[PDB]
Design a protein around this ligand. Structure first.
Ligand code: POV
Ligand code: POV
Ligand code: POV
Ligand code: POV
Ligand code: POV
Ligand code: POV
Ligand code: POV
Ligand code: POV
Ligand code: POV
Ligand code: POV
Ligand code: Y01
Ligand code: Y01
Ligand code: Y01
Ligand code: CA
Lengths: 594, 594
């Protein structure tokens, strides 16, 4: 929709050029006709195009130097004209000569005092998936992103503010981080810091945030720019001594580690969707900072919560084992009625000393399910499972108070969710950590992507198996006696967890042997070993990147564990530079051998 | 703890430099202030730093030649001063100029007669995981390890004993083996043997042991230094003739093979924790020595003990098959009482001729279990299993004497441990050898690393399955009738070795179909095929390094088999050089084609 609208405008531009003799003589290098056209009376010099363009934009756009000069002595006021469309709003001819790097034509427009502070506020210039370039809004931003060091030196001299911000708030240093050629942005970043030699009317230029509060150093980490991260990090390290093949380097940790309640660089890499951003975790101030947080104050407090959680689930288990049950009051309805016990009423539930021991163990599992809904809910997948466990304990709390039949259904969800959250505390162990990443990527990327092909095969054969045995007696082969049991039996024959139905004392239907032989080939052989082969490649991919997926679990745990525990038992990392003559900062010393 | 203490001392050094005008003028190249400071009265020349350092240490540490010379004519007695801390104790300025390779400043301190036998006995110089360098203690050791051939020639002339030993006992040749740049240590090893041209007041320098009794040749094998092993081996080989493309080389085998009761090089590579040390087993005197020990005297005596052990386990088996049993004296307690035989008392056990044949077969399995506890216990995993077997035979010996019920529990351990020690004698066969390395690395590296995630899933669903069927009659579906049977049934449904519970003649509970369908997906599909895919990569890794893992089993067997058999049936390997005019040594001839 948006692309089809944009394509009809770029074809409409080439029509309006082709119709106008003025614009066609500018597109071509036709200085002959531009003489003869401009000597006519009134000439339609200020005629508009499809993009809002003028004649002097066209000569700048097609790199026609000789046609662009003749239009400037004819009409000198075309230099001050922006494009007036919606898709190129504000773009002047000084932007177009800067992008095309027409070095001779930039000096011409600066001699005609073209404004170097004109903002290209269109929609082909926004940072968006619709646009292939994001060059900013000012001519200094366009020249820096095309790697034109001569034009950047040229129009800073003519007075381009280097501290200018576009709509997103990005300065010229934020935009250089977002460019795809990362090597040339490192040479260009240094050239723009050789300037800013002014009065420094705020904090210096590499410390100015955009509208999301990111300085250029944090934006190089959030976006995943590892080349511009290491280049910007060398302003922060500080070599103490060099003793042969040894170097004691002292890193800064001011924007990397959490100062107060602001979001630090470790909190922003975890809370972003770029897979490239998790390459910053392997960098030389950040790799040593996570190991200090984890080995000292993270792994003690994570194996302490993990052992308080085991004693909570064993206490919840034994008060589901010893739940109150009484013999059945009624008589059996049908011969298919197997239930012979029944749960007690609330009055008769607690009338013995062993019921008072259970009442203590039941108050603990209620209090612990309220504390989960005060730590977690007023704020990944184990967020949802610890909340869902906490509801199921309070759903079966209500059913004990108002005496309601069917407490086994909230308890059975609470047993298998309460026990399978012990898998959360497996990221404290390096050899057990990414096992839960394999269980995640097999469920939400292999099973939830191939169950749609199994539910087709199960519904096809369970309906065939049901009507084959629909005339038969279920007291011999009762696998398919009604339709929900034929679906459950066919799901079990698929996974080969119950044996195939056979009697050998009666004559089975003729279509049974043919249908079950076709079933056991497409279901048990072929489509069950597709899934085992799909999950075998998911295992291989995760176990290959095994140690970098564990370190992203350690960062996310330490960030979680610090913002919820009180500050008095979480010391700040590093050495404080007050009483060593280094400032107010917090340094991390790294000694290395080369 | 130790690292946080070390970091606060290296920041305290940079503060005390920055405070003192004397030390700050030495850190910088400030010969101006050092003139004006030293001309003041008393100057605090002997002022101490945070590391125990003086002013002349600082100028040596920051490579300031012009500042270090002015401090020597001012105070000439600063040359004889060690650092006085705990982390740099004994280090002089002559060590610091040697490490930094300040060639002009070393000749200055030797002109000021700095002692070349001063020991850097700190804690930043010990061989330790805390330190990134191990350079020794003397200036000759520091210069040799930084590959400075000019300083080593310089201070041997000024009288550095080349035969000096640090606290670990290492000479200058032991320290060169421990260095990470192995190629430059080979050039440096030869230069220090061009010296030792003295009276040779003990055995020569490449034969001097440290405090663990290792010469440099054995230390290059224990540490895994294969480059310095082949370089030191060429002093031992001896070419006899060269007949075209043929070479009869004669190797020495004095330190490689076991002379007496001392530990040889093959006994030290097996008994070390370096994985690098097992690369020495593929070297040209050592690869041919293991094949001679195994093909001649190892494989006969290992297939002879392996056939005496089969006749021992068949004899132990048939006296467990024919154990004394009598009909049950009591009557059945409950309908769940299935036992209808009972073991005899000791009086009535041996009263027939077939009991006298068994008594012979039972005395053999008692004697053979005592001999195991006289060969093995007065001294890897099959150490423990042959000892555990030997206890279980003597536990069930006691229970036969004092008549005690329950001999089936010591026997059942003794049957499966006695038979699975036949897998020990599978390293005598090259195609069966590393199969037991795959069984080891799957148990103690895959199962004991993923059973913690299965015991979470089994405890979650066995508790759910138990309370679903807790109101139901167990005479139809009795898989989960009490809680230890619900755990054993859920472990069996996990591994898919019993069929899923179904009746089809009664109505099962509603939560059963939902819980078992969720169980059969996460347990039988997903987490059972994780483990099969994890063990599939353990197979692939071991079968790749298949032949070098078999040769480390052959070395460890031959070492074991030689120190336990008497010497009269184990001939020494090689040809003795007495009656061929070669010494007292034992040579191994290798003929090769190039
Ligand atoms: C770190 C990892 C730990 C490792 C494992 C360590 C522990 C693992 C194992 C642990 C125990 C093993 C159980 C054995 C069964 C006998 C017990 C018993 O006497 O039960 C009695 C009732 O008991 C109840 O009713 C239980 C209900 C409440 C339990 C908790 C109360 C205190 C909670 C406050 C603090 C909670 C924690 C605080 C939370 C932070 C009666 O039972 P019985 O009739 O005698 O049973 C025989 C049945 N049979 C005859 C058929 C055979
Ligand atoms: C290298 C690999 C070898 C390959 C395989 C070769 C061997 C493999 C096979 C071997 C034999 C197979 C057995 C067949 C059964 C008949 C035997 C018999 O007569 O038993 C009798 C009792 O016998 C006993 O009580 C046995 C107890 C002691 C056995 C050892 C005694 C001498 C040990 C000293 C030296 C030990 C060695 C020294 C140690 C260094 C009675 O038995 P039965 O009542 O007639 O049984 C019929 C039962 N049925 C009727 C229900 C069916
Ligand atoms: C699917 C679920 C699977 C996992 C289930 C987990 C659930 C239970 C969770 C955790 C249960 C308890 C921990 C288990 C292991 C014991 C200690 C240990 O070695 O762990 C860690 C050290 O931990 C330490 O720091 C030891 C020093 C004591 C500090 C406090 C420890 C708390 C122990 C109880 C005091 C509590 C006080 C309240 C009283 C109850 C070692 O971790 P690592 O170095 O990173 O290992 C990586 C290397 N590896 C993998 C190769 C080995
Ligand atoms: C009421 C009782 C239960 C209540 C709580 C339980 C509710 C569920 C718990 C947690 C769910 C909430 C977290 C979202 C999923 C996490 C994964 C994710 O981050 O993104 C995922 C999108 O996610 C989805 O696909 C949406 C989920 C659809 C089904 C949800 C309900 C079905 C229950 C499910 C029953 C499990 C079936 C087994 C047994 C029946 C994308 O996948 P990925 O992981 O990011 O990458 C893998 C892709 N790769 C392979 C290409 C690399
Ligand atoms: C991925 C998830 C899918 C899982 C698959 C299964 C999910 C199903 C989940 C639950 C279904 C069971 C609910 C329990 C209540 C019982 C009512 C009932 O259904 O059966 C009733 C019958 O009526 C029917 O036959 C209804 C089924 C019609 C065909 C199924 C199409 C729906 C699937 C389309 C989805 C397509 C999307 C998938 C492909 C893209 C009762 O059966 P009866 O007792 O035998 O009565 C017969 C009367 N007679 C005796 C006269 C003969
Ligand atoms: C097969 C697996 C693949 C499936 C593919 C689909 C192809 C489908 C092909 C054919 C299906 C067409 C069925 C024909 C109708 C017959 C009518 C009838 O009732 O039977 C009669 C006998 O009839 C016979 O016994 C015929 C014997 C051959 C049947 C087809 C064998 C398929 C060979 C495949 C070779 C390999 C090909 C594949 C290679 C990979 C009556 O017998 P009855 O004893 O009285 O039983 C009635 C009992 N009842 C009354 C209770 C109901
Ligand atoms: C899980 C356990 C599995 C294994 C079961 C082990 C338990 C039984 C163990 C061993 C039982 C007996 C040996 C079995 C094989 C026979 C000989 C042989 O070929 O082996 C070896 C030669 O062995 C020789 O040296 C033969 C020359 C006679 C010397 C003494 C042999 C002892 C035989 C009885 C006299 C004793 C007197 C006491 C009275 C009984 C060949 O070894 P290889 O060349 O290195 O193999 C590599 C090639 N391959 C793998 C491709 C083949
Ligand atoms: C009472 C009856 C039995 C009595 C004796 C039996 C006791 C046990 C016998 C021998 C044990 C003594 C040797 C230790 C294990 C050898 C492995 C080793 O050297 O290093 C291991 C550390 O070792 C461990 O992990 C410690 C073992 C913990 C559990 C021990 C008892 C459990 C029984 C066990 C029950 C087995 C369960 C199956 C069926 C039940 C490291 O593993 P690795 O091999 O060096 O390399 C593989 C890792 N890789 C893959 C990353 C490369
Ligand atoms: C990897 C190794 C772990 C293996 C997993 C399995 C290990 C288990 C091994 C052995 C257990 C069985 C021992 C035999 C003696 C019987 C006593 C008994 O347990 O049941 C008794 C009940 O009491 C209970 O319910 C206790 C169980 C509570 C929860 C389990 C916590 C232990 C696991 C925590 C460790 C977490 C570490 C793992 C995760 C990090 C008797 O049962 P009953 O007859 O039905 O009585 C009910 C009375 N009623 C009739 C009134 C209702
Ligand atoms: C399912 C597998 C995954 C599990 C995930 C967890 C999700 C859990 C979702 C739901 C669980 C919540 C249960 C609701 C409570 C009902 C109360 C009741 O007792 O039943 C009533 C009927 O009620 C019905 O039959 C409802 C119809 C089916 C609903 C659930 C189908 C799940 C569809 C999933 C589609 C694919 C989704 C997944 C795709 C991969 C009474 O019936 P009854 O005959 O009288 O029986 C009582 C007999 N008793 C008295 C002996 C006890
Ligand atoms: C009455 C008393 C004795 C009961 C004790 C209660 C504890 C067993 C509970 C109370 C608070 C719980 C914690 C509350 C919140 C969290 C955060 C939660 O983190 C996540 O969900 C992050 C997972 C992810 O995003 O991947 C993990 C469980 C944990 C530590 C809980 C572990 C179990 C705790 C310690
Ligand atoms: C009464 C008589 C006829 C019985 C004969 C007894 C033999 C069957 C026993 C006695 C001594 C036993 C040996 C004693 C000790 C050892 C060393 C033991 O070596 C290890 O445990 C090393 C394994 C490892 O470290 O990996 C292997 C079994 C073996 C050869 C035993 C094999 C079986 C032997 C020969
Ligand atoms: C009656 C029941 C309860 C007894 C339980 C039996 C297990 C405790 C035993 C039987 C089989 C044994 C295994 C048989 C073979 C091996 C391979 C073995 O591998 C090696 O040592 C190879 C080393 C090398 O050659 O370099 C290590 C012991 C292990 C895992 C054993 C460990 C203990 C096991 C599992
Ligand atoms: Ca079966």
């Amino acid at each position: 929709s948006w692309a089809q609208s944009r394509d009809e405008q770029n074809l409409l531009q080439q029509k309006r050029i082709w119709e106008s003799p003025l614009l066609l003589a500018a597109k071509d290098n036709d200085v002959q006709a531009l003489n003869k056209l401009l000597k006519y009376e009134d000439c339609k010099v200020h005629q508009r195009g499809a993009m809002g363009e003028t004649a002097l934009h066209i000569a700048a756009l097609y790199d026609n130097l000789e046609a662009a000069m003749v239009l400037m002595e004819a009409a000198p006021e075309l230099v001050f004209e922006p494009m007036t469309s919606e898709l190129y709003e504000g773009q002047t001819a000084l932007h177009i000569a800067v992008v095309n790097q027409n070095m001779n034509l930039v000096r011409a427009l600066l001699a005609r005092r073209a404004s170097v502070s004109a903002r290209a506020t269109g929609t082909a210039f926004r940072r968006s998936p619709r646009n292939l370039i994001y060059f900013g809004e000012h001519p200094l931003s366009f020249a820096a992103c095309v790697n034109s060091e001569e034009i950047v030196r040229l129009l800073i001299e003519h007075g381009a503010d280097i501290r200018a911000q576009d709509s997103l708030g990005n300065t010229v240093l934020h935009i250089l981080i977002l460019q795809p050629n990362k090597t040339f942005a490192c040479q260009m970043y240094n050239l723009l810091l050789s300037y800013d030699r002014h009065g420094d009317h705020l904090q210096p230029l590499d410390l100015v945030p955009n509208h999301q509060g990111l300085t250029p150093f944090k934006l190089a980490g959030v976006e995943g720019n590892t080349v511009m991260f290491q280049h910007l990090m060398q302003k922060r390290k500080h070599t103490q001594w060099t003793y042969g093949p040894l170097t004691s380097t002292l890193y800064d940790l001011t924007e990397i580690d959490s100062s107060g309640d602001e979001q630090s660089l470790l909190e922003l890499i975890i809370t972003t969707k770029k897979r490239e951003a998790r390459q910053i975790l392997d960098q030389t101030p950040v790799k040593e900072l996570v190991s200090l947080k984890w080995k000292r104050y993270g792994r003690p407090y994570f194996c302490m919560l993990g052992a308080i959680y085991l004693l909570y689930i064993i206490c919840f288990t034994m008060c589901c084992i010893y739940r109150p049950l009484k013999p059945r009051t009624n008589n059996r309805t049908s011969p298919r009625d197997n239930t012979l016990l029944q749960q007690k009423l609330l009055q008769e539930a607690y009338v013995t000393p062993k019921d008072d021991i259970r009442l203590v163990g039941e108050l603990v599992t209620v209090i612990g399910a309220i504390i989960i809904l005060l730590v977690e809910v007023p704020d990944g997948p184990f967020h949802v499972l610890i909340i869902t466990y906490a509801f199921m304990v309070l759903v079966t709390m209500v059913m004990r108070l108002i005496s309601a039949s069917g407490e086994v259904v909230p308890m059975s969800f609470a047993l298998v969710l309460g026990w399978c959250n012990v898998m959360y505390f497996a990221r404290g162990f390096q050899m057990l950590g990414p096992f839960t990443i394999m269980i995640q990527k097999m469920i939400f990327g292999d099973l939830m992507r191939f169950c749609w092909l199994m539910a087709v095969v199960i519904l096809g054969f369970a309906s065939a198996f049901y009507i084959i045995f629909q005339t038969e007696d279920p007291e011999e082969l009762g696998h398919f006696y009604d339709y929900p049991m034929a679906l459950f039996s066919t799901f079990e024959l698929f996974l080969t967890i119950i044996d195939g139905p056979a009697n050998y004392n009666v004559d089975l239907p003729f279509m049974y042997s043919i249908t079950y032989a076709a079933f056991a080939i497409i279901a048990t052989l072929l489509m069950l070993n597709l899934l085992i082969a799909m999950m075998g490649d998911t295992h291989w991919r995760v176990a290959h990147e095994r140690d970098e997926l564990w370190r992203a679990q350690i960062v996310a745990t330490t960030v979680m564990l610090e913002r919820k525990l009180p500050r008095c038992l979480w010391p700040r990392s590093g050495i404080c530079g007050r009483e060593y003559g280094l400032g107010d900062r917090w340094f991390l010393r790294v000694e290395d051998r080369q």
